Structures are given as structure tokens and as C-alpha cells.
Paper text:
N-myristoyltransferase ([name]) is an essential eukaryotic enzyme and a validated drug target for combating malaria. N-myristoyltransferase ([name]) is an essential enzyme in eukaryotes that catalyzes the transfer of myristate from myristoyl-coenzyme A (myrCoA) to the N-terminal glycine residue of a nascent polypeptide at the ribosome. Protein myristoylation generally aids in membrane localization as well as protein-protein interactions and stability by increasing the protein’s hydrophobicity. Although multiple Plasmodium [name] inhibitors have been identified, achieving high selectivity against human NMTs remains a major challenge because of the high degree of sequence homology between human and Plasmodium peptide binding sites, where all known inhibitors bind.
Residue numbers in the entry: 26 to 410
Write the structure that this text describes.
């Protein structure tokens, strides 16, 4: 609770507030020549391991570590269960670096007991585009918790990123760290109502029977945008144009290349869904969501919470409410239990009328080595995985 590590880093202190025009690094004029060239030292018995996520053996070790040891909610009901495919997809975006996928092994057993990763991305923050590392999947094995391994993982990936002449990073966390640039509550639209109530994800309102809740939280009968279809390769430049134009209104967003659109949006069953309303090669509307199940801890009636997470949604032919109603239906049609979304972009406006419930927490957006004013989450135009 006292931030002994984080207050040594170029991030804001917890009570810092910055003026409305500053937009620049905390530590500027960095020189690659000054970056530590060797890996940070580890205690005897532990070693760094650069992972090849395209290799089945390495990927399996990452998958096993995260499945057993990655993020849990604050009541330890759920643990994220990113698929091995999702991990491959998330980590091998265009121009990724294998040397930014770094683990720590326990030498005696040759097992992976720590991990952190980054991928490169261009991030526009308050109208300035900066090449950044997007950091994700920080994880320490449960048996090695509270041994200060996380600061070493963070410092080591920072070194590896700095060696590429990159000095800023973006990341999200459900925990409060110094210091969010924005903080977005999450909301959910129940689809498989009885399951969500039985596992403790949702509460049954005291005025409702289970049977009535199932009826009341039914989804729309048919699409508002009836021509929706899965995205195809030929749609990449059209999605690039539609999404790229939409995102320029926000204070924080990724500046996607055509290659990045193809990577992040072309569909992969049970990983990433993108639907488009296309006419004469123009993409008029798009819906996208990704698949991230949570293992339901200690519950033998169900295995996973099969959740869809809102990604990027843009409409020109409907209202935003109609678009997001269609997103919920498309998730339901693909057998998802729940549709989760953040109060970013225009999402907040739809939550009441589309019968979303408010979640039990918020997702914090962070920048490393960047000084600027924080802002309300409606100004956030990026969804991290
Ligand atoms: C220019 C390039 C820069 C690149 C780097 C950019 C920064 C990237 C930052 C990483 C972005 C990650 C994005 C994601 O992946 S967020 C998801 C994080 N992972 C999990 O929640 C999985 C389950 N939990 C664990 O695996 C461990 O509990 C973790 C690994 C979280 C801590 O391990 P452990 O419990 O064994 O603790 P320790 O003794 O080793 O270390 C204690 C220190 O760790 C600080 N801590 C705790 N939780 C987090 C957290 N979620 N982000 C950052 N720091 C965190 C804490 O403040 C303390 O420092 P201080 O309080 O003394 O200051
Ligand atoms: C159903 C469920 N399962 N688990 C394991 C949880 C925590 C939930 C609650 C629902 O949480 C969200 C709902 C919507 C969006 N984001 C989250 C969210 C919340 C906390 C942390 C993360 N991480 C770490 C940072 N990087 C992205 C992923 C994500
Ligand atoms: Cl493979
Ligand atoms: Cl977290
Ligand atoms: Cl009932
Ligand atoms: Cl391009």
C-alpha cells in the first residue's frame, strides 16, 4: 500500500494532478546508449527465458502459468482463462518482438514461474502520436508471490523496450496503481441469466423470480442492421477507414495501420468476432468483440464463464444504442453467457436502456513515462485485451 517500487518509476504520484495543456514525458531525451545492456540479475536458481509464442512448447508453458495464476476478481470467484490461441494472437501483432515476451524459470524444475509481455503500437495521446509498448500478462506463480519478482519483471521488460528506442508504455489494470490517466467502470449485459446468477456474477433482484429475470433479460428478437456479416479479408481497408476516422475524436487511441486492422479484426472463432455492414466496398457499420472466458473457481456445476468483451463498434446507419443491441444479439447467437463493456467511447449512453448492470469494479488506464492531465473515460478510444 506504500508504492516503494512504483514511486521510483517515471509515473505520477498518487495525488498528482497536471494542468490541462502539459503532454510530454517525465524523463525525456533518453539515449539507447545509456540503457543497461545485460539482463538484470536474478536470485540463484532462477533464470530469464525469452519465449517463442509460436512454439507449441513455449506457448504451453505460458498458457499453463496464466491459467493457474493470472488475474482473479477481488472475491476470488473467477480467474481469467485466455486461450493459447488468444495468447498467440495478442502477442504476435505486426512487427512484434520475440525479445519482449519474457519469462522467468525456476532452474531446478525448468518451469515458468513468471511472465510479462509487450507489443509495439502507435498511441495518440492528446493529439500527439507516440510509439509505445503495450504491456500485458504480468504474472507471478502463486507459490512465488510477495517475493518482489514483479518489480524485476517490470524493470527487465522496460530495459528491453528501451533498447528499441521506445520510452513510453500503455497498460491497464483492475487495481489502482500510480496513477490512472482514466478510470472506466465496467458493465455487463446478462445473456445466460440463470448461469450468471447461480455462479455469483449477477445478483437476482429481490422483486424478481429466477424465471422472471430470465424473461426480462431476453435479448432482441432480430438485428437492427440486418445485413451484418462476418468481416472478410477484402474489408480490411474499409474497416481501417471507418474505424480510423471514428477514433480520431478521442484523447487516447491506437493509430492502426492496415496490417494492424487485418491482425486485430479478421475473425477467429472463439477469439475475435468482427461483423460489418458493407455496401459497394464501404463499411457503413462495424461490431467487434473478443472472447475471454473466466474459470469459475471452486464451482463444479459450471466450468467457465464464457464472456464476450466489447472491442470497437462504429455505426453510420443506426443509433449507437441500436448498434450495441445488435452486438449483444450477435454475442448471444455465438453462445456467449454475457456481454461485457467499459464506459469508454460512446458506450455509457447505451447501458441503461439496454439493461446493462454495473460491474463490481473499474478498469484503470495507465501511461508509463508520460505527463498529462487525466480525463473522463468517455474520452478513451482504446480497448486493450
Ligand atoms: C518504456 C517501457 C515501460 C514498460 C513497463 C511499463 C509498466 C508496466 C507495469 C505492469 C503492467 C501490467 C498489466 C497487467 O498485466 S495487470 C494484471 C496483473 N496480473 C495479475 O493480477 C495476475 C495475478 N497476480 C500476480 O501474478 C501477482 O500478484 C502480480 C504479478 C500482479 C504481483 O506480484 P506479487 O503479488 O508477487 O508482488 P511482488 O512482491 O512481486 O511485487 C509487489 C509490487 O507489485 C506491484 N503490483 C501489484 N499488482 C500490480 C499490477 N497489476 N501491475 C503493476 N504492478 C503491480 C505492487 O504495487 C508492488 O509494488 P510497490 O507497491 O512496492 O510499488
Ligand atoms: C468476469 C471476470 N473475471 N475476472 C477474472 C474478472 C476480474 C472479472 C470481472 C470483469 O472484469 C472486466 C470487465 C470488463 C473489462 N475489463 C475487466 C477487467 C477487470 C480487471 C482486470 C482486467 N485485466 C487486467 C488488465 N488487463 C486487462 C485484463 C480486466
Ligand atoms: Cl502451433
Ligand atoms: Cl489487475
Ligand atoms: Cl423461478
Ligand atoms: Cl497503413
Amino acid at each position: 500500500p506504500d508504492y516503494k517500487f512504483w514511486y521510483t518509476q517515471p509515473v505520477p504520484k498518487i495525488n498528482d494532478e497536471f494542468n490541462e495543456s502539459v503532454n510530454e514525458p517525465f524523463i525525456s531525451d533518453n539515449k539507447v546508449e545509456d540503457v543497461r545492456k545485460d539482463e538484470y540479475k536474478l536470485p540463484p536458481g532462477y533464470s530469464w527465458y525469452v519465449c517463442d509464442v509460436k512454439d507449441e512448447k513455449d506457448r504451453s508453458e505460458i498458457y499453463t502459468l496464466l491459467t493457474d495464476n493470472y488475474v482473479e476478481d477481488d472475491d476470488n470467484i473467477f480467474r481469467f482463462n485466455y486461450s493459447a490461441e488468444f495468447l498467440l494472437w495478442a502477442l504476435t501483432s505486426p512487427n512484434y518482438l520475440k525479445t519482449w515476451h519474457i519469462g522467468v524459470k525456476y532452474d531446478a524444475s525448468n518451469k515458468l514461474i513468471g511472465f510479462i509481455s509487450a507489443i509495439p503500437t502507435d498511441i495518440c495521446i492528446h493529439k500527439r502520436t507516440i510509439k509505445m509498448a503495450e504491456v500485458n500478462f504480468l504474472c507471478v506463480h502463486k507459490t512465488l508471490r510477495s517475493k518482489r519478482l514483479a518489480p524485476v519483471l517490470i524493470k527487465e521488460i522496460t530495459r528491453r523496450i528501451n533498447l528499441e528506442n521506445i520510452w513510453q508504455a500503455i497498460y491497464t489494470a483492475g487495481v489502482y496503481l500510480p496513477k490512472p490517466v482514466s478510470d472506466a467502470r465496467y458493465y455487463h449485459r446478462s445473456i445466460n441469466v440463470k448461469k450468471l446468477i447461480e455462479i455469483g456474477f449477477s445478483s437476482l433482484n429481490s422483486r424478481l423470480t429466477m424465471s422472471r429475470a430470465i424473461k426480462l433479460y431476453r435479448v432482441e428478437d432480430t438485428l437492427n442492421i440486418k445485413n451484418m456479416r462476418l468481416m472478410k479479408k477484402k474489408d480490411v481497408e474499409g474497416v481501417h477507414k471507418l474505424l480510423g476516422s471514428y477514433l480520431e475524436q478521442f484523447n487516447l487511441y491506437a493509430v492502426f495501420t492496415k496490417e494492424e486492422i487485418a491482425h486485430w479484426f479478421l475473425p477467429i472463432e472463439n477469439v475475435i468476432y468482427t461483423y460489418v455492414n458493407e455496401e459497394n466496398g464501404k463499411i457503413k457499420d462495424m461490431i467487434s468483440f473478443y472472447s475471454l472466458p473466466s474459470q469459475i473457481l471452486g464451482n463444479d456445476k459450471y466450468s467457465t464463464l464464457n464472456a464476450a468483451y466489447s472491442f470497437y463498434n462504429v455505426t453510420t446507419t443506426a443509433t449507437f444504442k441500436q448498434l450495441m443491441q445488435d452486438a449483444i444479439l450477435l454475442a448471444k447467437r455465438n453462445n456467449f453467457d454475457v456481454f461485457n463493456a467499459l464506459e469508454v467511447m460512446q458506450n455509457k449512453s447505451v447501458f441503461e436502456d439496454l439493461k446493462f448492470g454495473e460491474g463490481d469494479g473499474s478498469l484503470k488506464y495507465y501511461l508509463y513515462n508520460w505527463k498529462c492531465a487525466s480525463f473522463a473515460p468517455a474520452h478513451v478510444g482504446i480497448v486493450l485485451l
